Design a protein around this ligand. Sequence first.
Ligand code: TPP
Ligand code: TPP
Ligand code: TPP
Ligand code: MG
Ligand code: MG
Ligand code: MG
Lengths: 555, 555, 555, 188
Amino acid sequence: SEITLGKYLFERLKQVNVNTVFGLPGDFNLSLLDKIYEVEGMRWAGNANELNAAYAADGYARIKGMSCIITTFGVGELSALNGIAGSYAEHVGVLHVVGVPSISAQAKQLLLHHTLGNGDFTVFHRMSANISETTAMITDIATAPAEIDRCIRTTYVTQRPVYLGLPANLVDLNVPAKLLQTPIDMSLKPNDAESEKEVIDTILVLIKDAKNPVILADACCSRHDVKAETKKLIDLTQFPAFVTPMGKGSIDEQHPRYGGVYVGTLSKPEVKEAVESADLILSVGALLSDFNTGSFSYSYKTKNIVEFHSDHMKIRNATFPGVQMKFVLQKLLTAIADAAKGYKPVAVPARTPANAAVPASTPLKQEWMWNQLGNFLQEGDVVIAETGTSAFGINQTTFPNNTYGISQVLWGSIGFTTGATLGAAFAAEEIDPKKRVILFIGDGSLQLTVQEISTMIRWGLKPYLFVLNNDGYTIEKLIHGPKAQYNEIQGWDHLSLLPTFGAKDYETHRVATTGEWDKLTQDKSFNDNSKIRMIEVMLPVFDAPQNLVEQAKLT
Amino acid sequence: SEITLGKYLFERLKQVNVNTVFGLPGDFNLSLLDKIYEVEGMRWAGNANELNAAYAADGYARIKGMSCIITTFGVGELSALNGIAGSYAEHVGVLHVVGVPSISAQAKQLLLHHTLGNGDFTVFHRMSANISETTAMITDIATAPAEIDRCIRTTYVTQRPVYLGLPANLVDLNVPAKLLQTPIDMSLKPNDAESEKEVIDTILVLIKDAKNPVILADACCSRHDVKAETKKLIDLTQFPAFVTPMGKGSIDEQHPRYGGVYVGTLSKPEVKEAVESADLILSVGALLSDFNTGSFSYSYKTKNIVEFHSDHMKIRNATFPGVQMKFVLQKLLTAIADAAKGYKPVAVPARTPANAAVPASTPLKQEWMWNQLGNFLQEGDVVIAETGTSAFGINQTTFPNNTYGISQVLWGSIGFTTGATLGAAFAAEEIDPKKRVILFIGDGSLQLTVQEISTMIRWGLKPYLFVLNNDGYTIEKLIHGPKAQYNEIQGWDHLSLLPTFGAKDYETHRVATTGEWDKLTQDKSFNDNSKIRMIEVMLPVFDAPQNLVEQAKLT
Amino acid sequence: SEITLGKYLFERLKQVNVNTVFGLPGDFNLSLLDKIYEVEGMRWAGNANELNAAYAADGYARIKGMSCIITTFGVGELSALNGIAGSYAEHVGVLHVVGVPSISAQAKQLLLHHTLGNGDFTVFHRMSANISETTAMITDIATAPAEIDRCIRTTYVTQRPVYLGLPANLVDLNVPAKLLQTPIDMSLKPNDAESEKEVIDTILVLIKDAKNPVILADACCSRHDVKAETKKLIDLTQFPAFVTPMGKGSIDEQHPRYGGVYVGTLSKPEVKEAVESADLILSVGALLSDFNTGSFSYSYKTKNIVEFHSDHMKIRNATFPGVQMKFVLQKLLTAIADAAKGYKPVAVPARTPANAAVPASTPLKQEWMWNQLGNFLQEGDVVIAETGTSAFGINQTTFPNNTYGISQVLWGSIGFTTGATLGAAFAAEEIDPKKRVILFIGDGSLQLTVQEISTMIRWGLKPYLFVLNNDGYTIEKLIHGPKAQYNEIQGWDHLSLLPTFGAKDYETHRVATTGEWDKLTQDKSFNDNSKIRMIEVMLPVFDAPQNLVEQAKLT
Amino acid sequence: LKPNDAESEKEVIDTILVLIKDAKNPVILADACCSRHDVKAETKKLIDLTQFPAFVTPMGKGSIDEQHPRYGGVYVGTLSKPEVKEAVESADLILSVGALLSDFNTGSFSYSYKTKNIVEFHSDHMKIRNATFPGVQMKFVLQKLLTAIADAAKGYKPVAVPARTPANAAVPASTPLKQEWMWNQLGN
Ligand SMILES: Cc1ncc(C[n+]2csc(CCOP(=O)(O)OP(=O)(O)O)c2C)c(N)n1
Ligand SMILES: Cc1ncc(C[n+]2csc(CCOP(=O)(O)OP(=O)(O)O)c2C)c(N)n1
Ligand SMILES: Cc1ncc(C[n+]2csc(CCOP(=O)(O)OP(=O)(O)O)c2C)c(N)n1
Ligand SMILES: [Mg+2]
Ligand SMILES: [Mg+2]
Ligand SMILES: [Mg+2]
């Protein structure tokens, strides 16, 4: 028996659990799109924007493991680029598949629509090359499947965007259906014995001489299939554990040895004192390490630190290529037992005290809210916070045990969260329908990717959208141009947005005073993901969380 | 006396009349943007999206001459690439300036934010080089002024996108103000003597041996400072004139020798025969050429063609590089006189009879609407059509004298119009407040960039947004997947769209029956561009321009 | 004043001392070629083969520093690829410049000759990408010079092939001649202080604990501008020094602490015993390190070794990216003094005894000859040996002080030496006209690139060509198929080759017995590079140097 | 080779026949892919059945018997014999067997077919003017064509074809060799 390349792709995707595809129909991808509808349990998001789709695909990847978006030749693929760049930058596995024109034996003299007009049809591919781990422009079905498998394996394995160009005339050719019986190998090859070894010797050597160690969970410790290894390291050692604004969400904040969020100079004096006073640092999932001109001053001089990355090791200045943090962390876990035996637990910074009762009419303030949010969250919630005050605000909330956070800290492209809510809420519906997805986004950013709420309504998703109305680009005004016109926006009837896009079963709320917040977030019918909800929080123009108003002065 | 580079840029942009600047503020252009406000007559669009900003810069360059858009490093600049490419393909003069981190720094590894994380900063600049006539990344004020001038001249002169990289530390340094006393030379140098000559000698011989020549206006005859020469050509020869779907708007359709729009297989038989029976073709502002599409086919019967290009000549198969059309067009008209003396004024096709009084309660159909439109239009209007059924149907409308059209025929990116509308309505305004701008766009494409209506409201612009609600992507359903889910969309409450974005003084209407359209378009108040208006035209799912629904069945 | 891009290229080359250009005239490179003739002291080799030219360019690079070859679009560039791959593989700086078709604003519908016929004109470039350090396909003279400078700087700096595509229409445009006054920066940026530091600490730490150290000069210690640093290391430490078959020629073999040539299992028992018995190895110019399936078994388990590379450091398994061996070796030289103070010189393997008198009629044997050659060589000679018996043979000759050897050990492409003799003898004529260039090549290989001797004659060069006639592909027969027909060749009148190609002032000799060899090589008029000379040595079919007949058994 | 898709090859014929009928001066043009593609029979039959004038491209020279009566010469664009250039360019229909070469310029000359009304026969597909029928291999289509063409070429008027070139006239044995004379004299 045979199966058409078009159907084989989706089949493979279903096998790797990417049950939702993102994008918009168009040139050279219409026939390919018929196929997805042929595979059981596959659905087509039906986005309203190649960008929003690229964003959604990122949120989906972050939650489900990896994702896939299909755009059209030229006009489609170029629109999604920024969303691709972001996924390339923050290590997100996204398979970008574009429907390419038919592959002919002679000059495609007649191809013009959606082209630069200069005859060069490889330009859009060459462009995506810069923000892609690898690219594959298929030409003969003799190995098309092997090539699909490869782009899928590479994406998942290395968690970075992969470009897959597929000519239209091939989506309908047949390939051996048999090929589908051997799953794709999604495993990493074991490390070079002699190096992983060397790496260990050294780390124990370091752990032994160290007197005040501290663990630091970072960006790449969340979606790199290394959650266990990390929970084990914390237990077996019992050293003080801290997260980075990018690592927040990947560590159980209700753990007895959790110190907090290390954001350098924006850290809590106690938190800052702890991390900097350590004589050894075990940074898991390393990717940030230094930030000077922007955000904070978290950079120092790398004082004797070990950096576990997905593919390499970094002890001081020496680098060990190929040595993958997973299998290392494992081999390093067996021997960590003895060397830590007589360790004296170093006191860890206490939790921030909850806000103490205040009259129900006091107007809402960000600092109060980011600290109050901790009471609404519940185990299992996926929280998403947009660049700007929100991004900063979420770093000051104590996460109930087991909560996934999404903050595009390194790339920082506003708008991105709207798309992500769809992709995330999507995956979430797929894993556990009772998993909630809360989103905090400022008024300024909603405008850039606003129409994506339409796609939320059409699928009957039930996410919580908190909109922060501080009338403008506060975060900007704080670093420059407080009253700058380019920092102000057009006023929008935020709430009515839902029904405008067709929301038939929704709820809209407007919180202005502490009282109003508690009553709502405490309602038992509100705590339940029964339907889409837009909650508009009214906040001051120059009100901002503490951590931000501090770096706002120097940067 | 002195002046900051930042202010010098906007002072220069003022001189060539780019009164409006597009884009969004970012972590690297914030300081530059302050200088715009330091120049009388200059404004900041205040876009809600970089892509839309780019679409807008396109529309504006089409009506005003050239334009400028500013984005921020990485995130903002990569968000506008689709727009840019389109401007590159259909030859629009768009300047793309991007705020870049201080290249004149001594720290390399000490700067991480809005990058691929690999340390490579030339990456985004290299990407745009593929769709830019030229680029320039400024490094020292010593020649920063010259570079700016060079970029501005090349944009206007060649009508293609230019990339200008601007490091932050450079916007606040001083340059000799004296420099702005000498304008930027937007003049084209004279062609090489003997070459232009050969071109004439050769064109004349062709005009003589021809027995049925025709003048064909294409995309580059409108905005290239060549309208005089064009009208003189039509007068002196009296040859029949036709326009391509990209040329419609650049030729007075009330002129006696005007024959109609040549859209290949979608033409009126008389028009198809008229053009194909030509033994010589003078193509003014040539761009489009033999090409096929999912919907139709386009191809000139004869090969005996003389293509007039902004920078060169194409006679049959020979190419005379550097021999610019405008100056050649002139030398031509001067020696053509005698060889066209005894020319026999070939008959030209007749206009199409305006629909016959149909009962007020008959349901609106596209064919009838495109034909009936001809009446609502008044001299001066700027008509914009969106890719899809609209783009195909605006060719069957008879244009009053002096009516310009904007149809992204070649690049064909849906969504483009909502943005181009704002930029176009802007330039119009600055040129003449009473000049109207009408836009027809399907219900589907609106979803991609809907939020740019926001920027329209904030500026109190008064355009006409005709939205064609035919429930889904009909143009697509016509070439494939008639009931395919990917061709369906989420129902939107189109009318309440204006109010949601804060419109206070607007006006919404819904036209369903032929009478309702007559009553509405014949109203004198409606005929007055007093306020932004939205008209929702309820149309049937598979309805489309007759000729189109005819070739969609054959192909 | 201005200068044409075409002339600017050659000008820049002259500045970097590449006084000879390689290649053959053709499409899109004819006008560019006129330019070289415009620059003083520049000459055009005038090759007879894009391959031979690519080979010659490699020999030239090896001797002069870097080189440059110009081929034609399609048919030319693809022929030189193998010679490029080789230069990429063995770290040779070669600038490949191909004359590309004119860059047009629209589709080059009419370009066909020298194309795959499918319209795709980037294919040949994409292909060369795999064996190129970097590539540059120039499009606008706005920065063409900066791009030329870059490809030239990259080539020289990193000593690897660089692809430079140059459209024909640009070779004749003008660029600011001023630009030529600022030489290109050919210096390496200093190393990261904190790492180069770490690297040092460790190396002394290692040198201190070491009891039996040995220096090992390798491939990249000859043309990496690190000759001094290396001569100093040997003196200051006084450790035993050895070379690899690829390093041979880069170390003064008449030095008191020279151990010999380490080829693993093919080494001299004493030599093998020394290197393997060391407890520390300082491999300078590292690039080989391990060879198992082929040549020899030189691979072991990397027992505590330090590898100095042009761009990185390798101590054990740890790697230090960016740390360049030069500046390191320097910083490591200042501190090496004290730690070596009380070192006890470890005895070094003696020289192989010269052959003891044998009757003048004894027939020639390779072992006897490779050992006898040492008496003919003189200080300053550039010796070249081809893959096969020769390659192996040269490893057993004691090099008079200061002699450069050329043996393509890693890539090993027969034929390559013929071209190299031209390129090498060329450069040699340029630096010191009295420098001799001896070439040893087998009968089998001469056939592959034979016509290149023509180019030697036309320039009046005076190299010594020793042809080894053992009637076949001996080296092959030894590893497999002793009597295999594919291992035999067609008989050629070798000597007459010179006059056949036009040699008017030459000498041909045929050595068959030891006697004959001594008489000739000892003549005082023969020791002088007065004219081209072909010496045909008659040797047995299965005669081979010792070192080879040993590994010939296992591989 | 497997048989072409039924209805497609069909459409191709229907369309080619209609073109052969409306033409008033068709020509057969042998290109690079008519020689080594197992299509020589079909080619000769085409020349016989229609009697249309036949010409070869510089890549087709060799695949057509140059002694045949309907043979007109080599079409090398601007390097052709005026009669040949005019003969080909005056064609209102062109049957290109084994098409490969197409409008192209070179440092030495120019090459371009006057008309666009061309039916290109390719090893794996059909090119009628601007439409491309993928997968419809020429050899089998060429056959179905010859079978239905018979009648529409019944009253065809055998257009005149250019005459061969006269072999050099006895020149004194001591005259210095020149290329033009040699290429012509080679013929013998
Ligand atoms: C694509 C893109 N363009 C521009 C920016 C620069 N930027 C950063 S924050 C911001 C405004 C976000 O304002 P809002 O949602 O109002 O946030 P808050 O006021 O809550 O901080 C802008 C325009 C960006 N990150 N990405
Ligand atoms: C950016 C972009 N994405 C996708 C497409 C493919 N496409 C072409 S037309 C079309 C639908 C436009 O629909 P609508 O405005 O409803 O069209 P109508 O029904 O009037 O044809 C789509 C998705 C494109 N041209 N550009
Ligand atoms: C391009 C290329 N093709 C094939 C070979 C394989 N090869 C290695 S040695 C050899 C023969 C060289 O023989 P000769 O010059 O006779 O050497 P000798 O007999 O002196 O060893 C061949 C064909 C090669 N190295 N490179
Ligand atoms: Mg705000
Ligand atoms: Mg529609
Ligand atoms: Mg031999």
